[PDB]
Every structure is written in C-alpha cells, then in structure tokens.
Amino acid sequence: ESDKTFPIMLNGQVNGYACVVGGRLMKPLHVEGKIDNEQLAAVKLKKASMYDLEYGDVPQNMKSDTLQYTSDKPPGFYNWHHGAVQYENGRFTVPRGVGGKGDSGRPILDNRGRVVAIVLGGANEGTRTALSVVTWNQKGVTIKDTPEGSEPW
Amino acid sequence: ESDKTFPIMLNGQVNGYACVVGGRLMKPLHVEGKIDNEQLAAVKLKKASMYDLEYGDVPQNMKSDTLQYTSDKPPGFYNWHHGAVQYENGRFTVPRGVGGKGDSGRPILDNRGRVVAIVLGGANEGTRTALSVVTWNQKGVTIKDTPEGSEPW
Amino acid sequence: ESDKTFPIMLNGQVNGYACVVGGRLMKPLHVEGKIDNEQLAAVKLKKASMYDLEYGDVPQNMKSDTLQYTSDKPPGFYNWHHGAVQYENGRFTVPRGVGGKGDSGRPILDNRGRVVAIVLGGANEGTRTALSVVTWNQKGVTIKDTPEGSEPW
Amino acid sequence: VIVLCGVALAILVGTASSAACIAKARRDCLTPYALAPNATV
C-alpha cells in the first residue's frame, strides 16, 4: 500500500507525508520540514496557495514508479494507510477520532491499487470524522472538499 | 539496555557516543563529530569545558526514552557496553587493553536501568586501567574523575 | 564476488562504478555524479583525461581493502559482474549487446580474485561486442584501450 | 522630472502589478489542471 509513499520530516520527526502521482510529487504546503529523499528535495516546488499544496515534477528516474490516478469515486469503502475510508455523497469518512495531526499528505487508494484522494486533515461530523481532502473531478479538475471546521492534520 | 544510546558520526564513523539523561543529551566536548540521531542533532549544545561536556534539552516526543539516573553506587559488577565493569574504590575498572578509543561517552548502567557514569577515556599507567568518568555525588552534584594519565578515547 | 567495488550515485542512478585498486580510488571521469560511500567521496580525486579516468589515494582506513591490480593478461576468460568475458587479440570481447551504459567503471576480475582492467564502454562490429578498457602493459605501464568507434557507457 | 518619474512609476505599476495579477489568475487557473495528469483542459 504505502510502498510508494514518502514521509516528510520536521527536525527528525514525522509531521506529514508526500506522495507521487502522475510523475509529480504532492505535499501539503502547511507541512513545514524537508522531504526525506534527496531526489525529491531537489525538486523545485510550485505553491498552489489556495490548495494548501506544493508540487513539482519528480526526477525522471522514478518516472515509472509514480502512482496512477483514477477519477472513479463510487461511494463505498477505500483503502488508507491507517484503515479503510468510506466515501459518501461528497464526504470521505473515517471512524470518529482515529487518525490525527501529522497524518497530512496520506493518500487514499482504490481497490485497483491506485490513488483517488489525499488527506489534509478533517473533523468529526459526530457519526464519522470527515476528512479535508483533495479529490479530482469527473473531468479530472482537482477539487478540494473540506467540511467546515476541519482541522489541518 | 543500549537501545536508548546513540553513536556520533565523525567522517561517517562511530568516533563517540552520546547519552540522554533526564531529558537532556550529553556527550563529551573533546569528542568531535555529528550526533547520529537527527532530533539529537537539533539540540542546542551548551558547553561545560571544565567537565568536557556539552548538553541541551530534548523534545517531549522523546521524553520517555531518556536515561534515568541516580547517585547510589555500591561497589560491584556494573553492566557496560563491553559487558561489564568493576566499580571499586570509587573508580570503574576493566581488563587492561579493552575498550579504548571510540567508546568515549558510553554510559554505565545499574541493572535497574539507571545510568551511573559516562566514560571520558582511559588511564593505564602503573597498576591497572582505570576509566575517567563523570559521576553524580550523593547530593546530585556532578563530579568528573580523571586519574593521572587519563586520556580521552 | 566483487563487493569491494562501489558505483557512483547520480540523481539516484548507477550511471557508473568505481574500484579501489592499489589503494587509489578510480572512477571514470565521464561518469557524472557522486560516489556512494561518503568517506570515499571525501577524496579529492585527480583526473587523467587522456584515460577518461580520475584517481586519488583512498583514506587511511581502507587502503588495506583495495583490489590488487594484475599485470598478466593471458588470453582466456576473465570474470566480471555480468558473468565473465573473453579476452582475445588483446581486447576484451563480450556477447553482442550485453552490458551497456552505466557499466563504466565496473572492474574485470582475474580468476585468482584480482582486477585486470576497468571497462569504459564498448562497440559492435556486427559479430561481437568489443570493450574499451584501461590496461597495464607487461612492464606495468597503465594504458587505455578503445576499439574502432568505441562508445563510452 | 517629477512628471516623468510619475509616468515611469505609473508604468511600473501598470506592468508589474497587472502582470502579477494576471500571473496569479493564470497560475491558480492552471494548477487545478497542472496537478491532474489526465485532465482535458
């Protein structure tokens, strides 16, 4: 699952994650610190001020090792580094209170071994912890959905 | 025992070690090099040249792994990195020729898991090899022992 | 066996290799990037552009570990990383199209467990691959050899 | 000279500030697509 994911380090401790999709690396912009792998650190990031994300095209070595994307977001369960996540009617849902700060940048994966969303934080609706996430449109446009009050992990 | 103990990287080699006691890192000032742990490397070292040490606090995420310490030190067997040392007549002793250069900063431990001293280097002239060390008085005040001819490892 | 050999890591790519022969680290000059081992990288190599090679004394901690260069080069089969290679008419010859870019700096091993030459690249006439190599005359004079239309790897 | 510097300053704002605004809109309108490897812009 996490086989192709990469941790982001702040002063020697994990405080978030970065992941590579479509041959470019994405990491939350609010996640201060340095990406572990030097090849990724050599990348010049572009800052998507309103996405709370920065990204850059990965070195052409791991070009073959990027995660592939799929627009497919049927409602139901999806795999995650810390569990299975349930998406419904525009809401990605996690069992209330599990997961938390430092888990930003976690990818969400389709059962067909592919990524569908990245987590930036979340908040509990009461029945579930809704996650502030990036999720790309039917037309691929990278939408950001984040129910009100969602805390950044 | 030794799990909570860390090397010093000098020219990418283990030229020394550092210990974290009661939440503060300590390593000899004379031993040059880079602390292996990244969090420990971030510590702001404060010098104590008369003790030949430098030290600083460590973050709360690594609070529990700090070495516990005490002054109580009856003579007898004490565990050490090279198996054990003999503490007697107020000094630590070993088979002459063991240890040597590189083991500076290695702690000595009470089988309760309590550090009793830190090694600063060997002394060998006359009768037998005695180890220069920093120690804790019954009042807690630190004492640095260096039998004549003490040399840093 | 050839674990006493070290490739160069350029952007995380093994674009070439290096070998410690006679206590001197040698790598192809054309192979851009930094050597794997950090202690070896501290060596400020001295280049010999006519050989497309650069050399320098390995530090005092591993010169004992160096490979022994071999003067004698009788016609026959010599060990390599990609199995073994034939030596004929004064040139190393290899199966057509096996091995290529990135293999530069790979040492060729005397069956006795010694290094006879270091490869730069090759060529094909159509029947067989001819290698380009640094060599040593029976007298001991170090030389470079490059077949007609040699391509560096 | 005052009027000339006024013109130069106005031109500086006209160029660099309009360019900054346009770059901002272009950048933030591209990024929803530049992040998507298969989006048909």
> Cα C46 from chain centroid?
16
Exposure pattern of A89-98 as b/e (b: 16+ CB <10 Å)? eeebbbeeee
Residue pair A17/A105 in contact (Cβ under 8 Å)? The answer is yes
d(CA C92, CA C131): 5
Taking CB atoms and an 8 Å cutoff, what residues of chain A touch B41?
A: 12
Q: How far is CA C115 from CA A109, C19, C66, C109, C130, in A?
A: 50, 9, 10, 4, 19
Q: For chains B and C, count residue pairs whose Cβ atoms are closer than 8 Å.
A: 6
Q: Residues B153, B122: contact at Cβ < 8 Å?
A: yes
Give the whole-angstrom CA distance, residue C90 versus residue C98: 20
**Chains contacting B with at least 3 CB pairs below 8 Å?**
A, C
Catalytic residue among B52, B103, B132, B150: B52
Mutate to test the interface with B, among C38, C40, C43, C58 (most CBs of B within 10 A): C38
Distances in Å between the Cα of A116 and the Cα atoms of A64, A143, C48 are 19, 12, 53
Q: Token pair of C74, please? A: 């009788």
Method: cryo-EM
* CA dist., res. A28 & res. B74, Å (int): 55
Residues of B with CB below 8 A from A9's CB? 38
Give bridge partners of residue A95 from the DSSP assignment: A128
DSSP track, B36-86: SSHHHHTS--EEETTTTEEEEE--GGGSTTSBEE-----SEEEEETTEEEE
Judging contacts by C-beta atoms under 8 Å, the chain A residues touching residue C13 are 61
* Vertex A60 angle, CA A59 and A64, to 5°: 115
Q: Output phi, psi for C47, to 5 deg.
A: -90, 155
Assess A71–C contact: CB distance below 8 Å, yes or no: no
Phi, psi (degrees; rounded to nearest 5) at B46? -110, 125
Q: Compute and round to an integer the Cα radius of gyration of chain A.
A: 15
Q: Where are the beta strands (DSSP E) in C37-94?
A: 46-48, 53-57, 76-79, 84-88, 91-94
Q: How far apart are CA B105 and CA B153, in angstroms?
A: 9
Which two tokens mark C32? 């851009």
Q: Are A139 and D40 an interchain contact pair (Cβ–Cβ within 8 Å)? A: yes
Q: How far is B23 from chain A (nearest CA, A)?
A: 16
Q: Which two tokens stand for residue C116?
A: 């006879």
CB within 8 A of C118, min separation 6: which ones? C19, C21, C26, C28, C53, C105, C106, C107, C108, C133, C134
Enter the tokens of residue C83.
Answer: 């199995």
CB C4 within 8 A of CB C39: no
